[PDB]
Amino acid sequence: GLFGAIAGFIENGWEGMIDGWYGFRHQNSEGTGQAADLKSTQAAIDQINGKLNRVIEKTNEKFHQIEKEFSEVEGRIQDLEKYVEDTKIDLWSYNAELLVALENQHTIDLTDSEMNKLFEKTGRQLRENAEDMGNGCFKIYHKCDNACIESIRNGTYDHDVYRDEALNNRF
Amino acid sequence: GLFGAIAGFIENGWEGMIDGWYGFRHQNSEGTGQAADLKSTQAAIDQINGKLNRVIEKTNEKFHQIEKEFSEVEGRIQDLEKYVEDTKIDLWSYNAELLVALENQHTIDLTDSEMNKLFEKTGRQLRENAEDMGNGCFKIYHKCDNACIESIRNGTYDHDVYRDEALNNRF
Amino acid sequence: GLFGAIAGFIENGWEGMIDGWYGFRHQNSEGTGQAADLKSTQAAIDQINGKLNRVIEKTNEKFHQIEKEFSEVEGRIQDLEKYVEDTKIDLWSYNAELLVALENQHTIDLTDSEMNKLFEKTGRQLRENAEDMGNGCFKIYHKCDNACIESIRNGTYDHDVYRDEALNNRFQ
Amino acid sequence: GATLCLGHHAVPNGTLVKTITDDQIEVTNATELVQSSSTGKICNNPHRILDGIDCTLIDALLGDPHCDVFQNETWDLFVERSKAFSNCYPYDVPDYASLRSLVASSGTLEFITEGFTWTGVTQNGGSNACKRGPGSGFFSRLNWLTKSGSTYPVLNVTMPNNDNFDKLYIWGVHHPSTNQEQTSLYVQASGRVTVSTRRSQQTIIPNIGSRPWVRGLSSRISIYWTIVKPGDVLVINSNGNLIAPRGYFKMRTGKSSIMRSDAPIDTCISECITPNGSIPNDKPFQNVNKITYGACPKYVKQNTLKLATGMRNVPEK
Amino acid sequence: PGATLCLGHHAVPNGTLVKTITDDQIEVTNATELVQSSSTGKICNNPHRILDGIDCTLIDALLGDPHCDVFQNETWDLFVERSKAFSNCYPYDVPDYASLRSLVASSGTLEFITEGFTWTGVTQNGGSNACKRGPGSGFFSRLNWLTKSGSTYPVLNVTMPNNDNFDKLYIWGVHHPSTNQEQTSLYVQASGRVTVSTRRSQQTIIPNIGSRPWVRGLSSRISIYWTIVKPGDVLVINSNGNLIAPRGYFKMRTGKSSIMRSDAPIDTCISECITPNGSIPNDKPFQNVNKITYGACPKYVKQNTLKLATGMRNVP
Amino acid sequence: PGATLCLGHHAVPNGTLVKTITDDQIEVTNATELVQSSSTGKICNNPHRILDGIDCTLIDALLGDPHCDVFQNETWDLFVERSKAFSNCYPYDVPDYASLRSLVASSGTLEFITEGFTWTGVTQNGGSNACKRGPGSGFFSRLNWLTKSGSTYPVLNVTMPNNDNFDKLYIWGVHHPSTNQEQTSLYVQASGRVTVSTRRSQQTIIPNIGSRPWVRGLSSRISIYWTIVKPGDVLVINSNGNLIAPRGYFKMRTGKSSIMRSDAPIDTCISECITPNGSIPNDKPFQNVNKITYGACPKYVKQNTLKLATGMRNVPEK
Ligand SMILES: *[C@@H]1O[C@H](CO)[C@@H](O[C@@H]2O[C@H](CO)[C@@H](O[C@@H]3O[C@H](CO[C@H]4O[C@H](CO)[C@@H](O)[C@H](O)[C@@H]4O)[C@@H](O)[C@H](O[C@H]4O[C@H](CO)[C@@H](O)[C@H](O)[C@@H]4O)[C@@H]3O)[C@H](O)[C@H]2NC(C)=O)[C@H](O)[C@H]1NC(C)=O
Ligand SMILES: *[C@@H]1O[C@H](CO)[C@@H](O[C@@H]2O[C@H](CO)[C@@H](O[C@@H]3O[C@H](CO)[C@@H](O)[C@H](O)[C@@H]3O)[C@H](O)[C@H]2NC(C)=O)[C@H](O)[C@H]1NC(C)=O
Ligand SMILES: *[C@@H]1O[C@H](CO)[C@@H](O[C@@H]2O[C@H](CO)[C@@H](O[C@@H]3O[C@H](CO)[C@@H](O)[C@H](O)[C@@H]3O)[C@H](O)[C@H]2NC(C)=O)[C@H](O)[C@H]1NC(C)=O
Ligand SMILES: *[C@@H]1O[C@H](CO)[C@@H](O[C@@H]2O[C@H](CO)[C@@H](O)[C@H](O)[C@H]2NC(C)=O)[C@H](O)[C@H]1NC(C)=O
Ligand SMILES: *[C@@H]1O[C@H](CO)[C@@H](O[C@@H]2O[C@H](CO)[C@@H](O)[C@H](O)[C@H]2NC(C)=O)[C@H](O)[C@H]1NC(C)=O
Ligand SMILES: *[C@@H]1O[C@H](CO)[C@@H](O[C@@H]2O[C@H](CO)[C@@H](O)[C@H](O)[C@H]2NC(C)=O)[C@H](O)[C@H]1NC(C)=O
Ligand SMILES: *[C@@H]1O[C@H](CO)[C@@H](O[C@@H]2O[C@H](CO)[C@@H](O)[C@H](O)[C@H]2NC(C)=O)[C@H](O)[C@H]1NC(C)=O
Ligand SMILES: *[C@@H]1O[C@H](CO)[C@@H](O[C@@H]2O[C@H](CO)[C@@H](O)[C@H](O)[C@H]2NC(C)=O)[C@H](O)[C@H]1NC(C)=O
Ligand SMILES: *[C@@H]1O[C@H](CO)[C@@H](O[C@@H]2O[C@H](CO)[C@@H](O)[C@H](O)[C@H]2NC(C)=O)[C@H](O)[C@H]1NC(C)=O
Ligand SMILES: *[C@@H]1O[C@H](CO)[C@@H](O)[C@H](O)[C@H]1NC(C)=O
Ligand SMILES: *[C@@H]1O[C@H](CO)[C@@H](O)[C@H](O)[C@H]1NC(C)=O
Ligand SMILES: *[C@@H]1O[C@H](CO)[C@@H](O)[C@H](O)[C@H]1NC(C)=O
Numbered sequence A, B: 001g002l003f004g005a006i007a008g009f010i011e012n013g014w015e016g017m018i019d020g021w022y023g024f025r026h027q028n029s030e031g032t033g034q035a036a037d038l039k040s041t042q043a044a045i046d047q048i049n050g051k052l053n054r055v056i057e058k059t060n061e062k063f064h065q066i067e068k069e070f071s072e073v074e075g076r077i078q079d080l081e082k083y084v085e086d087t088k089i090d091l092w093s094y095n096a097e098l099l100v101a102l103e104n105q106h107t108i109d110l111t112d113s114e115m116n117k118l119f120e121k122t123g124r125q126l127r128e129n130a131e132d133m134g135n136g137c138f139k140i141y142h143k144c145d146n147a148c149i150e151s152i153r154n155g156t157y158d159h160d161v162y163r164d165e166a167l168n169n170r171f
Numbered sequence C: 001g002l003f004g005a006i007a008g009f010i011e012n013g014w015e016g017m018i019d020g021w022y023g024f025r026h027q028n029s030e031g032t033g034q035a036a037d038l039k040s041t042q043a044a045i046d047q048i049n050g051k052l053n054r055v056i057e058k059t060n061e062k063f064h065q066i067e068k069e070f071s072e073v074e075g076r077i078q079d080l081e082k083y084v085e086d087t088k089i090d091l092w093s094y095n096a097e098l099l100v101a102l103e104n105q106h107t108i109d110l111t112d113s114e115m116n117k118l119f120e121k122t123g124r125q126l127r128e129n130a131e132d133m134g135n136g137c138f139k140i141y142h143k144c145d146n147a148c149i150e151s152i153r154n155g156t157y158d159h160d161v162y163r164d165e166a167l168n169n170r171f172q
Numbered sequence D: 001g002a003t004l005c006l007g008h009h010a011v012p013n014g015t016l017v018k019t020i021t022d023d024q025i026e027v028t029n030a031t032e033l034v035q036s037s038s039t040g041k042i043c044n045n046p047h048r049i050l051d052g053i054d055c056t057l058i059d060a061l062l063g064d065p066h067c068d069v070f071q072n073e074t075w076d077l078f079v080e081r082s083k084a085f086s087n088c089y090p091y092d093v094p095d096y097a098s099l100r101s102l103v104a105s106s107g108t109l110e111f112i113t114e115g116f117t118w119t120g121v122t123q124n125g126g127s128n129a130c131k132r133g134p135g136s137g138f139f140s141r142l143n144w145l146t147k148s149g150s151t152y153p154v155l156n157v158t159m160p161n162n163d164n165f166d167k168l169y170i171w172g173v174h175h176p177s178t179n180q181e182q183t184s185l186y187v188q189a190s191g192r193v194t195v196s197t198r199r200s201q202q203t204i205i206p207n208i209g210s211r212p213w214v215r216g217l218s219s220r221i222s223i224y225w226t227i228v229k230p231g232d233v234l235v236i237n238s239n240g241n242l243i244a245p246r247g248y249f250k251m252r253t254g255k256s257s258i259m260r261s262d263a264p265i266d267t268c269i270s271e272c273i274t275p276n277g278s279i280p281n282d283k284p285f286q287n288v289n290k291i292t293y294g295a296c297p298k299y300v301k302q303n304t305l306k307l308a309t310g311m312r313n314v315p316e317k
Numbered sequence E: 001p002g003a004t005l006c007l008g009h010h011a012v013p014n015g016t017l018v019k020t021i022t023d024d025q026i027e028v029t030n031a032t033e034l035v036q037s038s039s040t041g042k043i044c045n046n047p048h049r050i051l052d053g054i055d056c057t058l059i060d061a062l063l064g065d066p067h068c069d070v071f072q073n074e075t076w077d078l079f080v081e082r083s084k085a086f087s088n089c090y091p092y093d094v095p096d097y098a099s100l101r102s103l104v105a106s107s108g109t110l111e112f113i114t115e116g117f118t119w120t121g122v123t124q125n126g127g128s129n130a131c132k133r134g135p136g137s138g139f140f141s142r143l144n145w146l147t148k149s150g151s152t153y154p155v156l157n158v159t160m161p162n163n164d165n166f167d168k169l170y171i172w173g174v175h176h177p178s179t180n181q182e183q184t185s186l187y188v189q190a191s192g193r194v195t196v197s198t199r200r201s202q203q204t205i206i207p208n209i210g211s212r213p214w215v216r217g218l219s220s221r222i223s224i225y226w227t228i229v230k231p232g233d234v235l236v237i238n239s240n241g242n243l244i245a246p247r248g249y250f251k252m253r254t255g256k257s258s259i260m261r262s263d264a265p266i267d268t269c270i271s272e273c274i275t276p277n278g279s280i281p282n283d284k285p286f287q288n289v290n291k292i293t294y295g296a297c298p299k300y301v302k303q304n305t306l307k308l309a310t311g312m313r314n315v316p
Numbered sequence F: 001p002g003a004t005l006c007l008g009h010h011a012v013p014n015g016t017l018v019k020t021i022t023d024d025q026i027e028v029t030n031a032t033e034l035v036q037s038s039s040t041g042k043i044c045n046n047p048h049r050i051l052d053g054i055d056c057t058l059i060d061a062l063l064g065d066p067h068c069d070v071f072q073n074e075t076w077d078l079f080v081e082r083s084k085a086f087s088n089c090y091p092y093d094v095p096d097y098a099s100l101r102s103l104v105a106s107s108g109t110l111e112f113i114t115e116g117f118t119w120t121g122v123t124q125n126g127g128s129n130a131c132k133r134g135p136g137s138g139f140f141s142r143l144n145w146l147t148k149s150g151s152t153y154p155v156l157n158v159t160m161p162n163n164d165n166f167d168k169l170y171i172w173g174v175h176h177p178s179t180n181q182e183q184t185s186l187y188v189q190a191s192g193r194v195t196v197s198t199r200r201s202q203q204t205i206i207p208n209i210g211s212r213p214w215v216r217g218l219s220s221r222i223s224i225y226w227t228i229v230k231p232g233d234v235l236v237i238n239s240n241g242n243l244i245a246p247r248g249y250f251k252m253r254t255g256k257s258s259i260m261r262s263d264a265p266i267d268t269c270i271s272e273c274i275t276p277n278g279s280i281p282n283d284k285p286f287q288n289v290n291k292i293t294y295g296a297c298p299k300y301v302k303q304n305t306l307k308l309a310t311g312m313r314n315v316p317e318k
C-alpha cells in the first residue's frame, strides 16, 4: 500500500481482533489487553459504504431498443446493428473493468491510510513519554495502568503527568 | 483525506488566512502573527491549474452528424439512429461523472498532502528545539522573536544556535 | 508527488546509483560508500510490471465489421455508419488518454511512496541514535563502521548497543 | 513501563480482487458487481406483460382469427413465443421488422372502425385458408374487396384525420397465382393500389404467379401501412387487388417494447426482464443477456467483477 | 521562555459541494462548473456561414420554388430551417427525402450550372397556377415540365457527359397525373416512362395515375429523384412521357457544412458552437443544452451540473 | 565521532516526457509506447487465409465474370479487393450491392453447387460480346440467360426444395432491354416479370426498358438479386420473360471471414492483425495505423503516441 502500514511496518493483521477494523493491544503491569478503535474503524467503513453506494447509484432505464438477435441474413443494416451493440458492450466492459481496478486500488490505499493515521495520532498523544519500536508498537517509559491505557485510547492522555518519570527512564 | 492533516490533526481552517492556502501563525513575547507560505500554496495552485487545463483541453469539432429529432414514425433505421445517440450520451455522461469523481478525490488528497508536507518540513527544520503538540502546532523551547520566527518561515533557521537552551528547557 | 520524498525533501536523484532504484549513501570513519536497496527497488519494479501487464492484457478479436470508407455519396445510412465509427473512435481515444494519465500519476506517486517508506523504515531502525537532517540524511551520533552501516542496510541494527554513546553525543 | 501496539484485523482467507497493479490480491471482504443468474421466469409486475402464446404481434395486429383474442390489447412488454404460428391467408410484410417495431413501441392494438364506402365492389371476402369458426373467413382488420356482378370500378375513397393523434392504417395488395384468378376476382387483368396522404404516396402493382404452397394457396397478400397525421387526409385509389382497411390503429408514444422469449410468466416483482427471465437490478452490471427491458444493470462481457469492501487481508507475515 | 508556531490552511465561510469517489456531497473551498447549461438564445453569425432559410426548406430552395429562388447559388456552413417554412409550388414528394436533404446540406452549396438539353418534339417550360411566378403561372426554376407538342410526344433520348473533374448532382422528376384524360392530354401515351442512367446506375420510374389529397388546387403530384454523375461518366435521360426534366446540375462539394432545425434568431456575435436553442460557449468540456450541435462544441451529457473542485476541503 | 546515512533514488541525465492528470509534460526515467503507429506495408499470408482478388471484385467472382473464373469454389478468411479490379462482362448493377458483398464476404466461400433446373420452352445459355469467354461471346458463369425458343416464351414456373441442413444462396437477375424491339425479340411478351419466393418471403421485379449509356457496346442492363433458402424451405421461380436464371446455389457459411480493400502486397510472414496499410503487430493496446482492421488487433485511437511511465520521476538536478 501507499502508506506502508498495512502489510508494511505493521507486519500482519490480527485475526483475534473480531470487534473492529483497527485497534490497540497493550501490555502493562495489570496484564495484557485488546480494544478496537471505533473512530478509525467507522471512518474506513463510512468511506467504503460511500463508494459502494456511488457504484450502485443508477440503473439505466431503457425500454424500446434495437434488435440484437436475428434469424435471417440481411447484410448492411443488420451489420450496423450488430456493430453498434458489440461496440457498446466492449466500451461498457472496459468501464466496468477499469472501475473495479481503480476502486480496489483506492480501497486498499485508504484502509492503509486509516491505519497510518491512527498510529500517528497515538504517537503524537504520547509526546516524549514513548518511542516508536518500528513495528506499530510504542514502548511507553512509565507506569501506565489500565486507566492510563484507556486515556490514551480515548484521547484524554495527559503527557505532562508522566513526563518526568518517562524522561528519566528514557535517558 | 489520505494524509490526515486537513480535517484531521489540523482541527479547522483559517478564514483569516486570505493571502495564501497554507501558512504559519505564531505567538511569542513580541505578540502574535500570521504569514502565508507561498511555496506550498503555489504547489497546490499549480497542480490544480494543470488538472483544470487538462480537463478543458479540447472541444471536439463536429459538423455534419446524424439527425437526432424526428417528426414522423419510421421504425428500424430511426430506431438505430436513436439507439446510437442514446448509447453515445450514456457513455459520455458516465465518462463525465467518473472524471469529476476521480479528479475531486485527487484534489482533496493533494491539498491535504501539501499541508502535511509543510508540517513535516517545519518539524525537520526545528530538529530537537521543538515538539509536535499534535494539533499542527510546534512548541518551541527557546526564546524565538519575530526575526527567529521569520528565519523558520524562510528556511534559514539554524537549530544549533538554540539547541543548548532548547535541550535544557525540554529535559 | 503526494508523499514529498522524490522531488521533495530528497533534493534530487543520484545519477551515480546505477544498480538500483533506491539505496543508501554513507560517510563514516572508514570513508564513504553507496549501496542499492534490493527490497524497495523490487517492490517498485513489481508494481510497475503488474500495471503494465494489466494495461496490455487483451486483444479485441473482431473480424467482419462495418465499412468505414465510402466511394459514393449515399446519405442517411452512410451518415449513420460514419457517425457510429466516429463516436467509437472518440470514446476509445478518451479511454486511452485517461488511462495513461491516471496510470502515470499513480506510478509517480508510488515511486515517491516507496522512497518515503524506505526513509521511514531507516529512521525507525535508528531509534534515538540518529536525527533526521531534513534532506533524506540521518546524522548518526556514534561510531558506525562499515559493518554497522551494513547492519542498518540489512535490517539487523541493534540500537541498544549504541544507545548510551548516542544519547551522550546528542544531548551534551 | 508498558507497551501499546496498533494493528488491524484479519481473517484466515479473504477474497481475491483485481487492482491497477494486481490481477489477484486478497482483501478481507468483497461484493459482486455482475448479475449472472436469473430465476428463469418473467415477473408479471410491475410492467404490463402480454404473453402472445401462439401469436406474433403482426398476426394479432392483422386479425388472424386465432389471434383475435388480442383485439384492443395493450402492453408494456409483448412477449413473442417461438411456438407462435400463422393460420390465415399467406402474407408477407415488406419491412416487417419496422412495422413490428413501431407497433411494439406504440404499445396498443386499439382499433377504431371507420365507415369506408366501397361502392361497386363485393366486400368481406373470405378463404378457407383462414377459417373463422366452422366457415371460411379473413383477417379481422382487413376487407377483401372483389368484383360486384361483372365489373370492378376504380375505387376512390377518402378519410380525413380530424383527431389530434396519429392514425395507423394497415392495408394490403393481393397477388393472385393465375391470370384466371386475377380476372375472376377483379375483372381488370392487372390491378393497382395507391394509398396517399398530403405529403406521401405508395403505389403497388401486383405480380401474378405461383408462390410456395401454404395452407392450400399459392397466392399471397403483401401488407403495407400508412400513418396519417392530424389534419392530413388518407386517400385510397385502386382498380383491383386492394385489401382494404376497416379503420385505424391509435398510435401512442411510451415505454412499450417487444421481446422474444420462451420463459414462463410468474407472479413476482422485478424491474428488469431478459429473455432468460427477470433479474435483480441491485448490481450495476449483468452478464445474463444483452437484450433487456426495464431499469436494468448494464450488460458486460465479464461473468464476475469483485468490488473490495474491506482492507488488504494480511494474516501471516 | 518559549513560543508556539502553528501550521494551518485557509477556509471560507461558504464553499461548494462536490462529489468524489466516496462522497456524493463534500464541501471544498472553490469549484468550477463543467456543464454548459445556458444559452443566449441566439445563433451567432460568426465564425460560421449561417444561411437562414426564413420561409424555405432546403429542398424547396433546391428545386426552385419561386418564393425560394432568392437562395439560388447560395452557400452555407449551417443552413437553418425555420418551422414557419412552407411550400408554394407544384405539390411534390421525395422518396428518401431525408437523404437528399442530408447530402445537399453536407455539400454546402446550391451552385447550379445550366446545361443545354435538346428536347426534340416536345413543349418545354410547362407552368401551373399552383406555382405562380409573378402574376402568371410558373414552375420550379430548376425543373422543366415537358409536354406534347402538337399531337405527338416522341421518345426523348438525350445524353450529357461529365467532362469536368467533379461530381454532378442532377435533380429530376416524374409527373403523376390524377386522371387518364390528364395523362393523355399532356403526354399522348396512356402510360409514361422515365429512365435516367449513368454507366454504373439506372433508375426507371412508371408514373401512377390517381387522385391524391387536394393540395393548392391539385390532386396530381411530382416525384423528385436524383442522380450523381461522376467525372468521366455520362448521364442519359430516356422518357416517353411524364418526364420533369433537369435544366442543369448542382455542383457537389465536400466540407464542414450541415443543416439545423431551429427557431432561434440570428445575431451579430462570435461563437464556435451552435445548438437549436442558440449559440453556447465552449469553454466547458460538457453541455446539457441540446444533443444537436454544430461546430466545436462541449460534449452533451445528461447531467445539468458537474462541479470540479479547484480548492481544498473547506473546514470552517 | 559520528556518521551520516543518506537515502536516495536514481536519476538519468535525460528521461522521457509523459502526461499525467495534473501535467501535460513531466519527465520520468523510463516509458513505453502504447500506440502502434507503423506497418511493414505488406499483408502476411499467415495465419489467416488471404485471397488476393487481383483483377476481380468479390461480386464479379461470385457472378462468374469470365476473367474471374479462376476464383470458382474459392474460400478465404480475408478477401483482398484491389483498386485495379475491373468488370468485363454484361453491364449490371446490384440493388443493395453492399449487402450482397458483405454477406458473401462473411460467408467465406464461393462453393457453388449446380442444380438441375428445368427451363421448359426457352433457349438457355444466352451469351454476349460484352462478356467474351475466349474470343467468342459468353455470359456470367453462374447465371443462365433464358430467351425465347422458336417464337414463344412460356410462363416459367419452377421449384427447388432445400432438403439439406444448410442455407442456400441463390443469385439471379432481371434483364432490362433498351428497346421494345429488343424486349419482344428476346422474350416475345411485351412486358416481363420475375417473381422469386420462399414460403414466407417474395421478390417481384418488373423489367425496365430504355436507352442507357453504352458499356462494352450495350445499352441494356442486368439487375442482380439474391434469395436465401433455409432448410425445409423451398424456392419458387415464376417468370414470363427477362429472367436471368440461377444455375444452382452458393453454400452459406458462418465464421470469421471478411473482406478488405487494399493495394498492399502479400508476403510470407506471420501476423494476427491486418490493416489496408499492411500487417501490424498487436503487442500494444492501441494503434493509429488504420481504423479498418481484421484479426486480433489493437484498438484504433486518434493519438499517434501515448507514453506509459515505467519509472519514477526523473530529478537529476535540484
Ligand atoms: C408452379 O410450380 C409449383 C411448384 O411445383 C406448383 O406448386 C405445387 O402445387 C402442388 C399442387 O397444388 C402442391 O401439391 C400439394 O401438396 C399438398 C401438401 O403436401 C404434403 O403433406 C401431406 C400430408 O402429410 C404429405 O403426405 C405430402 O407428402 C406432402 O408432404 C398436398 O396436400 C396436396 O394434395 C392434395 O391436393 C392434390 C391436388 O388437389 C390431390 O391430388 C391430393 O390427393 C390432395 O387432395 C398437393 O399434393 C405442391 O405442394 C406445390 N409446390 C410448391 C413448392 O408450392 C404450382 O402448382 C405451379 N403453378 C401452376 C399454375 O401450375
Ligand atoms: C376522389 O375522391 C377525392 C376525395 O373525395 C376527390 O377529391 C376532392 O375533389 C373535390 C373536387 O374539386 C375537392 O373540392 C374542392 O375543395 C376545395 C378546398 O375545400 C374547394 O375550395 C373547391 O371549391 C373544391 O370544391 C376536394 O377538396 C377534394 N378532396 C380531397 C381530399 O382531395 C377527388 O376529386 C376524387 N377523384 C375522382 C376522380 O373522382
Ligand atoms: C440514345 O442516346 C444515347 C446517348 O447518346 C445513344 O447511345 C449512343 O449510341 C451510339 C450508337 O451506337 C454509340 O455510338 C458508338 O460509339 C462508339 C464510340 O466508342 C463507336 O466505337 C461505335 O462504333 C458506335 O458508333 C454511342 O457511343 C452511344 N453513346 C452513349 C453515351 O451511350 C443511343 O444510341 C440513343 N438511342 C437511340 C434509340 O437513339
Ligand atoms: C530570513 O529571515 C531572516 C530573519 O528575518 C533574515 O535575516 C535578517 O534580515 C534582516 C533584514 O535584512 C537583517 O537586518 C538581519 O541582520 C538578518 N539576520 C540574520 C540572522 O540573518 C534573512 O535575510 C531572511 N532570508 C531570506 C532569504 O529571506
Ligand atoms: C441466456 O440466454 C442466452 C440465449 O438463449 C444464452 O446465450 C447462449 O448460451 C449458449 C450456451 O452458453 C451459447 O451456445 C449461445 O451461443 C448463446 N447465445 C447468445 C445469443 O449469446 C445465455 O447463456 C443465457 N444465460 C443464462 C444466465 O442463462
Ligand atoms: C474560485 O476561483 C475563481 C477563479 O479563479 C475565482 O474567481 C476570480 O476571482 C478573482 C479575484 O477577485 C477575480 O479577479 C476574477 O475576476 C474571478 N474570476 C471569475 C471567472 O469569476 C473565485 O474568487 C474563487 N472563489 C473563492 C471563494 O476563492
Ligand atoms: C452559379 O454558380 C456557378 C459556379 O460559380 C456559375 O458558373 C460560373 O459563372 C462564371 C461567370 O460567367 C464563370 O466565370 C465560371 O467559369 C462559371 N463556373 C462554372 C463551373 O460554370 C453560375 O453562372 C452561377 N449562376 C448565377 C445565376 O450566378
Ligand atoms: C433547448 O431546446 C429543447 C427543445 O426545444 C428543450 O428540450 C425540451 O424541453 C421541454 C421543457 O422541459 C421538454 O418538455 C421537452 O421534452 C424537451 N425536448 C427534448 C428533445 O429534450 C431544452 O429544454 C432547451 N434547453 C435550453 C437550455 O434552452
Ligand atoms: C494508412 O493508410 C491510410 C489510408 O491510405 C492513410 O490515411 C491517409 O493519410 C493521408 C496522408 O496522411 C491523408 O491525406 C488521408 O486523408 C488519409 N486517409 C484516411 C482515410 O484517413 C494513413 O496515413 C496510413 N497510415 C500509415 C501508418 O501508413
Ligand atoms: C477516558 O478514560 C479515562 C480512564 O479510564 C476515564 O476516566 C475518562 O472518563 C474517559 N473519557 C472519555 C471521554 O471517554
Ligand atoms: C547484516 O550485516 C552484518 C554486517 O554488519 C552481518 O554480520 C550480518 O550477517 C548481516 N545479516 C544478514 C541477514 O545479511
Ligand atoms: C485462500 O484460499 C485460496 C484458495 O481458494 C488459496 O490459493 C490462498 O493461498 C489462500 N490464502 C491464504 C492466506 O491462506
Ligand SMILES: *[C@@H]1O[C@H](CO)[C@@H](O)[C@H](O)[C@H]1NC(C)=O
Binding pocket: D029, D030, D031, D309
Ligand atoms: C462483507 O460485505 C457484505 C456486503 O457489503 C456485507 O453484507 C457483509 O456483512 C460483509 N462482511 C463483513 C465481515 O464485514
Ligand SMILES: *[C@@H]1O[C@H](CO)[C@@H](O)[C@H](O)[C@H]1NC(C)=O
Binding pocket: D071, D072, D110, D111, D112
Ligand atoms: C377499442 O378501443 C377504442 C378506444 O379505446 C374503442 O373506440 C373501440 O370501440 C374498441 N373496440 C372494441 C371492440 O371494444
Ligand SMILES: *[C@@H]1O[C@H](CO)[C@@H](O)[C@H](O)[C@H]1NC(C)=O
Binding pocket: F013, F014, F015, F316, F317
Ligand atoms: C532533457 O532534454 C530536453 C530537450 O529534449 C530539455 O528540454 C530538458 O530540460 C532536459 N532535462 C534535463 C533534466 O536536463
Ligand SMILES: *[C@@H]1O[C@H](CO)[C@@H](O)[C@H](O)[C@H]1NC(C)=O
Binding pocket: F030, F031, F032, F310
Ligand atoms: C525501460 O522500459 C522498457 C519496457 O518496460 C524496458 O525494456 C527497458 O529495459 C527499460 N529501460 C531501463 C533503462 O530501465
Ligand SMILES: *[C@@H]1O[C@H](CO)[C@@H](O)[C@H](O)[C@H]1NC(C)=O
Binding pocket: F072, F073, F111, F112, F113, F114
Ligand atoms: C465446387 O464444389 C462442389 C462441391 O464440392 C462440386 O460439386 C463442384 O464440382 C465444384 N466446382 C468446381 C469448379 O470445382
